[PDB]
Amino acid sequence: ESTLGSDLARLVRVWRALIDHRLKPLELTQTHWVTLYNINRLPPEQSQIQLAKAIGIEQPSLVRTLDQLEEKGLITRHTSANDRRAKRIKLTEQSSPIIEQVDGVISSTRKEILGGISSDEIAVLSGLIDKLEKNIIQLQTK
Amino acid sequence: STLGSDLARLVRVWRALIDHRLKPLELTQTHWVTLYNINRLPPEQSQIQLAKAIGIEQPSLVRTLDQLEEKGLITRHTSANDRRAKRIKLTEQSSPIIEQVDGVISSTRKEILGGISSDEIAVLSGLIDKLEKNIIQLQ
DNA sequence: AATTATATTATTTGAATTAAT
DNA sequence: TATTAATTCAAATAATATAAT
């Protein structure tokens, strides 16, 4: 009997565990390291809602995580000029050598994983993530 | 590429769509995931084994099995052979609840895969398998 | 040495709450 | 009023290191 959804959950859990264990020197929590990885790739003109959503945490959690990062000296929250409602999260100068080790390990770990399999598997696999995801979100609106 | 992150996303939205479909049952996601895995796996697959399939730590699974048991859905009994290893299985009373959860999950799995091709399905099932093993080789 | 429990110890959430547009 | 953010704070939720048979 088919168990594909559980097997994608498991796959992701083990992968995530590999990155966390390799970052164990930074003594950084999974939420914190995933959140930093995400702030760096996304623009400040993203809502905390989409950021929180981009990471896989809800909005009430992101703030606290960002409050934590604020007390670690790693981020700041600049209240906007044309949108006083919003705040554009920015990584602090002192964060580079940290963003640098999180990213290096995420990239390296990915390329390893995608280094013994074929281009066809990777491409066909790559496309579907986007197909399956689009389709599920479509049903979401029913 | 953000393949890792794009994949985690699909996992989140697959799970929440199931969670959406199962809402009138009023179980936390943790409860239905666990009930599913208890039914899906051999009863010899015991606490520590159970928790990996569920994804979560065994003490936290200790909390869940207590709640599920107080609700009368599961039995935790001493194996007649060993006095520290326990049998976990569903009650007759959880019979309609699991047909519910299992039905949403299987229908969801069958509908999600749709418009995707047979050779496309074959690769995702086969790649996952490989990648997990690659990840198990690293470590 | 293994299989299940506790116990702090901490985060994750869900419910209104503030605030601007 | 109706909208979209950001936030916050009691009570669930799980985790980490720690037990007990």
3-state helix, strand, coil in chain A (%, to 5): 70, 5, 25
Let me know: does B86 contact A107? Beta carbons within 8 Å. Answer: no
A53 burial (CB, 10 Å; 0-12 / 13-18 / 19+) is middle
Let me know: does B123 contact A125? Beta carbons within 8 Å. Answer: yes
Q: Of B115, B120, B134, which is closest to A135 when you measure between CB atoms?
A: B115
What fold does the segment set B1-139 form as a domain? Arc Repressor Mutant, subunit A (1.10.10)
Give the type of residue at A132: L
What fold does the segment set A1-142 form as a domain? Arc Repressor Mutant, subunit A (1.10.10)
Check A136 against B1: CB less than 8 A apart.
Answer: no
Distance between CA atoms of residues B100 and B22, nearest Å: 8
Residue B127 neighbours by CB under 8 Å, 6+ apart: A117, A121, A125
Q: Which residues of B touch A137 (CB under 8 A)?
A: 13
Q: How far out from the chain centre does Cα A99 lie?
A: 13
Give the type of residue at B71: K
The method recorded for this entry reads: X-ray
Give the type of residue at A89: I
Q: Which residues of A touch B128 (CB under 8 A)?
A: 4, 7-8, 11
- Give protein residues whose Cβ lies within 7 A of nucleic acid chain C: A 29, 31, 57-58, 60-61, 64, 68, 83-85; B 46-49, 58-59, 62, 65, 76, 82, 84-86
Let me know: does B62 contact B74? Beta carbons within 8 Å. Answer: no
What is residue A87's three-state secondary structure?
strand
Check A5 against B123: CB less than 8 A apart.
Answer: no
Rg (C-alpha) for chain B, rounded Å, is 17
3-state secondary structure chain B: CCHHHHHHHHHHHHHHHHHHHCHHHCCCHHHHHHHHHHHHCCCCCCHHHHHHHHCCCHHHHHHHHHHHHHCCCEEEEECCCCCCCEEEEECHHHHHHHHHHHHHHHHHHHHHCCCCCHHHHHHHHHHHHHHHHHHHHCC
The tokens describing B124, both together, are 């995702």
A61 CA to D10 C1' distance (Å): 15
**Structure's resolution in angstroms:** 2.0
Check A114 against B3: CB less than 8 A apart.
Answer: yes
Contact positions of strand C to protein Cβ (< 7 A): 2-7, 11-15, 19-21
The residue count of chain B comes to 139
Size of interface A-B (CB pairs under 8 A): 130
Distance between CA atoms of residues A73 and A82, nearest Å: 26
Let me know: does A30 contact B19? Beta carbons within 8 Å. Answer: no
